[PDB]
Design a protein around this ligand. Structure first.
Ligand SMILES: [Mn+2]
Ligand SMILES: [Mn+2]
Ligand SMILES: [Mn+2]
Ligand SMILES: [Mn+2]
Lengths: 137, 133
């Protein structure tokens, strides 16, 4: 799976979890691309069996597509929580996550997963971390 | 991203051999020499380095400033992933991939994280605990 493919899958998954479906035009708007670019990537996803570009129903995900989408949306959310927890400006989080989510091994993602749990488990740890952020003196 | 990789490698080559040859850059980044030459022309125009008559490529004060920074970012990210327990064999490839898509704000916060764990070994142990759980 290429990085741009992961973005589409992430996007289609979220659209269905919200509107209950995913239209080519909704995808092009969300990723800010021309519908032809979308249609092209869709056929590839259809051939790789992540979804079906069916008639009447439209864009439907296969078990394989729901499995991957679920993991990709989870990956994105975990990375956001991660940056948020260590004190990154909120306005800079989405852009950083969108860029790095694709270049991280599941191994790293799981380790980031334990770190997040590490800080959520004891608030006293967050305070210690934030205190070190004031050691810039 | 790719332009940053170049600046990153060039800096390291000079901090090692004391200079950087086109051939050495092509090999480090596993690319064709014709491809490296094209990038060198751009970096030169942008005033990061300079092709000197008989000295190969030399970095300007700007190139040195940027390069030192990119090597630091790379090393910091490596220690970070190592500290939280990532398989050492998978560290280099992840850092190479993510280093270009991280704001300095993010880098600075990660630097504080590494420092957090470094000042108390008890913390690394608690983190290692959750891993087993
Ligand atoms: Mn993305
Ligand atoms: Mn994402
Ligand atoms: Mn890189
Ligand atoms: Mn690097």
């Amino acid at each position: 799976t290429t990085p741009s493919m992961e973005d589409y899958i992430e996007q289609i998954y979220m659209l269905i979890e919200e509107k209950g479906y995913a239209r080519v035009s909704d995808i092009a708007e969300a990723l800010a691309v021309h519908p032809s670019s979308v249609t092209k990537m869709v056929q590839k996803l259809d051939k790789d069996e992540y979804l079906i570009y069916e008639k009447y129903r439209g864009l439907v995900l296969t078990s394989k597509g729901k499995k991957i989408g679920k993991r990709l949306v989870y990956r994105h959310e975990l990375l956001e929580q991660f940056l948020r927890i260590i004190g990154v400006d909120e306005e800079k989080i989405y852009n950083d996550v969108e860029g790095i989510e694709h270049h991280l091994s599941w191994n790293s993602i799981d380790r980031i997963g334990d770190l997040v749990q590490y800080f959520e488990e004891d608030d006293a740890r967050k305070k210690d971390l934030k205190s070190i952020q004031k050691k810039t003196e």
